[model samples]
Target chain A: KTGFFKRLKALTLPQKQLFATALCQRMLPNYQLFSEVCEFGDPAVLSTALELLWQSLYDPKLKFNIDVHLQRLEDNTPEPADFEAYGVYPAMDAVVAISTLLGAIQGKIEEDIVNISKLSSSTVANYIEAISDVDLVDEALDDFVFAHEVMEEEKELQNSLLEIIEENPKITAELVKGLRKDIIETGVSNIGISV
Target chain B: KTGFFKRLKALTLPQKQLFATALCQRMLPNYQLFSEVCEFGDPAVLSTALELLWQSLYDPKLKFNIDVHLQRLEDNTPEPADFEAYGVYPAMDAVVAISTLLGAIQGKIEEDIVNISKLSSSTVANYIEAISDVDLVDEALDDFVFAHEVMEEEKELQNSLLEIIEENPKITAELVKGLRKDIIETGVSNIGISV
Candidate 1:
């Protein structure tokens, strides 16, 4: 139980940091981030977390054991058929969860950067950290174009994902996992949350 | 005037000889002329006349003034700018005359060879002598094509000349002079006729 919780907690921190950095880089600058957020929070603490997230996503040799996660989930299932059926569901759930965190990071950064009235020096600084992921920005643009081509085939599917996100403001972990799996299944490559 | 007429008359006999030879050659192996009628009537007869005509018309080395009796007639009347207008007429008339002679020769040969129903040793001799002027036949074919092209434009003029020749079966001295002048003026490079 300790090993499982330790791994879970470890995964959450890295995931949170990656999402936050990606949002800030996408929406804010470094100089603004430091000057604005240093007064409110320990800049070293935030910076270390951001750097760890950046390294995890951007390290040239970093590898995630996606098969291991699927195996663990399958082992917990009751029936063999249930494992087969539910295997994709958990994989999808993992992806959606990550996507949700990334989306939250993006939303926070957007709120700070875009709204002049609500934006403070600290909020903007946090916004910088939140949208720091360069990879996310690149993938977003790629996905945007891919989605556009797909929509030309099925007009109804065009804004369905965005509509879902709007209706459900709190993107569940399963939904984020589903979205991440969807992006990969759609043949999008080089996706990452970066600073 | 005596010297001129003598030279002219002397020239005329040779001219007649050349004309007859050319005519026989043109309608060779099928036509014959009696040597008693004119020395030129003998297809074997060759003289300075042939050389002079060939030189004036066909000789690459020599250039002679083209003069036709018809051109003279036209010029004698009033304003004849160039020999061209009426000059070509006589040459065309000459061609028609030659054609008629060939036709007559054909008739004569048919009379002797077919109508008489008599085969003699001289038959081959007659044919050989008759065909001695075959060179002129080639020239006649060439002239015929040329005259046909010109006649396409001046149909009435050509028809009038033919009409006159048809009415008068005898080839007169004046007609020969007209024809010679026409040949000279037409600048037909290769032409020969035999009676």
Candidate 2:
């Protein structure tokens, strides 16, 4: 029983394990999975994880909002700074997570909405135009419509995640979780999960 | 009689004596001037004098077209290849000489045409604009014009010489002599012998 509990405690979720494995493969030797553990468990962990990632990816000559967040985290207190300084890393993480979630939901939605073999070019262009008009940033049900339209092309998932992570480095867990749940519910209820 | 000739030579060119005295004062020890009798006095002696003067004035990298001219003088070789391999030294020397001549001509022209105290803005601008338009390779007239314009400024004489020498490494002795004669006849008819 003790061994079973120990193994279970060490066991990571499939998504988390996959992400951790990918990151570990990319990182230098002598690195630890401490940040990953924290990131998977608590949303605030994303702040640290992203800061480390940002530093690893970019030249030190460039200054970023992540520096301020790390400073605040170290001090264990918040200081007067711009919204970007406080918000950048968390927002970036949320965007990354939401992009992944939205991609999955869109895939499900597309499978339910249209028969691709029978769909005409005009119908596809119309669907695309409709999706482009919907505000993904808004919290309304129309946002799911956009996600559904986007999901019609499941291949776009990786690109969407990359684009959001590149543009906004201040993602939050709440936003990601919200997006993921919304996408899952919409896809499951309307289209079914399989293509 | 030899002593008398020496004294007469010294008296005839007091400035040349001063220049030679200055050179003697400035030169380091162990420096030797080579001399060898030829049809034109001593080609080796003249070469040594030119070499010393060139070394004193120009950068170590300075080159001229003298090698090719000397080669032609020694052996009447006509092909372009005969001259081409000599590098830029002789051409550079010619450029410096031509620039100096231009500067001298410009000074004389300015003395005749421009009033010292009442120089107009348009006049100055016109001079600069005209000089700036001077092209080294394709526009020989422009180079002459630039030299003439700079001479008008008086203070810009050294700068103009430096610029022209730096820009045109292929300037010819004939070009310098021609420009000097043209400017003198056109701008200063009563001027005596140059150099």
Candidate 3:
């Protein structure tokens, strides 16, 4: 189960950042859905942040004000207490994933960047738990979530992303551009929201 | 590790609520510290809700407006993005612990009641992760957190609390008063804050 995170730890910093960006990008649909329902948060903030992160990946001179971006991410994040719906949990995760990615960049911790994988996966796990019957015990429920189709899809998507990032040894305009284009073209989030 | 949670699941509804209240009492310190530092959230909301929860445990005639208390709890929770400090995460946990407990009672799901144990412990785990050096991989870092003194103390405290709750099958005002008094007299939160 943690093997994915262990593999993520082995990636180079650029590759790790790239992976983080991908996961963050996929998570935005969660925030978008929550925002539309709650009339809170601008999905644009996340989209803009992801755009900047993508630009920074290929453009060496492109620099971001780390603290400013962190603040923006923070401000846009939803407090779960503020909402009644379960959507807030995933929405919060989406924003925090961006904040965490920024922290990785600012703190310059390669290890910190890999946590995005776990963070995104946990969002899905929580979603599964929320949607499931309340009768299962903790361990059986963990297994239920582990074997759920959505989680399997999440794992596969992450595995494929890692494979793509690993194959590209160098961070190039072509690599970043192509990766960004594909994710945007899909226009879907980790939880399969198209918005 | 999850043995605690599994055992928690096996406990009766009232026993589980007692455990939740105890853990929530210990967690208030996390919120208090964050509130003092960030000047965010009224700790009273959490305290009041907990007071009611304790009262409900002993008095079968006592009733709470579940949605209202949930709203109060949600409003008092700190959004991590709202604070620059790491304290908000734990602070948020403290409030959410109360909210989750309310959800269990309101939802009438005995299973949901036991999650407080995991929820509090996870807050400690995240704290350990944050305080540790960023050199370890995901697995090693988890191992490191598992063995850390703070986490061990959290486990011991939970185990002891569970033992006490399990030994007393029947809920009485005397039991509730003693548990509340002892935890308050200690005047410390799960993370060991005196405030």
Candidate 4:
């Protein structure tokens, strides 16, 4: 856990932003699923938010009103209390992750972009806790989560993402486009949900 | 769980703000503990933020820049990845809770002040999950949490707080002072630790 966070902390600004955007893209399906079932929020708002974030990655000159998008994302976030379904938890996480990214972009939060890694892993951790049929406690649960296949995948995805970002000499439009395409084509969320 | 949220949502703006301020007060000891143990963050920043929030509750004419405090809170918030101790989780939650309150005050977020209830409860729930000795799963874990003594205390505190806020005819300096004094005098956090 500390290992990847250290690497994430070492990333260049664009590299960090790109890494965060990719994770946000993965979470979109969670939002998409929740929106369809609960009939709450516009998944399109999240999509547009991600689109602007992706565009900003390579095009430093591209400027838009971040506050507007922040408000839109906040408006689209679902409160867990409003829904009995467990989907609201992950769905809320999706929108909050995007807003956290925007906060980093807007300079409202410091070192917040790096925290996105922990946030993504937390979504997986909560998903594990919610779905585990077997009883586990304390260090046992800790070991269970650490060795869980889904968790291993989460760590692998983040590790591979860091390597890809680090290999690039500079963040380019092509790199951003290809990464975005790869994630979108997969159509899987952080929790392995497809919609 | 849903009952208090419904009551919280029905509160007037000032009432809601006051309730959130009280909960933030309770969590300060958690931050205080982390700061003392981990030697990270100035508890004063959180204190001043709360001071400003409490002042805002009763003094309609009291005005200060919300952005300054928001930035201070963000800067002071300890990233869990940066700390090896378990205390960092609750400590981070402390600062994030204050920042969330500030966001609502700035109108940057809608219905966020009410979410403070869930945030506080989540802090407790995580604490329970972290310390539990027995292995429980699925609905069993759910029932354990719902019936846990600590969880019951959390609900009782929140319920009593709601009743107190509701009984008040208006938000006044006296009410604010009384609430602040009561919580500070207790000096216990949501997880029952007093600094």
lDDT of 4 by residue, B78-115 (tens): 98787766778888998999999889978835489999
| lDDT-superior candidate, 1 or 2 | 1
List, for all models, the DockQ compared with the true complex.
0.00, 0.00, 0.01, 0.01
- lDDT (Cα, tens digit) per residue for candidate 3, span A51-110: 888887988888768888789889998887777766688889998988888888988988
TM-score for all predictions? Answer: 0.15, 0.15, 0.49, 0.49
lDDT of 3 by residue, B1-195 (tens): 557667778788888888889889878876875676567889989889988998888789997688998998898887766666667888888898899888988888787677788888898787645533334567755655554445766888899988887778766688788888998887666654555
DockQ of 4: 0.01
Give the winner by lDDT: 4
- The share of true interface contacts that also appear in candidate 3 amounts to 0.00
lDDT of each: 0.30, 0.28, 0.77, 0.81
Q: Looking at every candidate separately, what fraction of the true A–B Cα contacts under 8 Å does it contain? A: 0.00, 0.00, 0.00, 0.00
Q: Across residues B29-118, which tens digit of lDDT does each residue of candidate 1 receive? A: 111221111111232222222334433323337643323422332232222232222212222332333333333233443222121111
Model 4, span A1-195: residue lDDT tens = 457777777778888999999999989987886676667999999999999999898677999999999999999999988887667888899999999999998994548998888889999889666633334578866665654445666888989988898888778788899999999997767766666
Candidate number with the higher DockQ (1 or 4): 4
Error of 4 at B167 (Å): 76
Better by lDDT, candidate 3 or 2: 3
| Residue A100 lDDT in candidate 4 | 98
Model 1 CA lDDT for position B13: 29
**lDDT for A65 (candidate 1):** 44
lDDT of 4 at A171: 81
Worst 10 residues of 2 chain A by lDDT: A25-34
Better of 2 and 3 by DockQ: 3
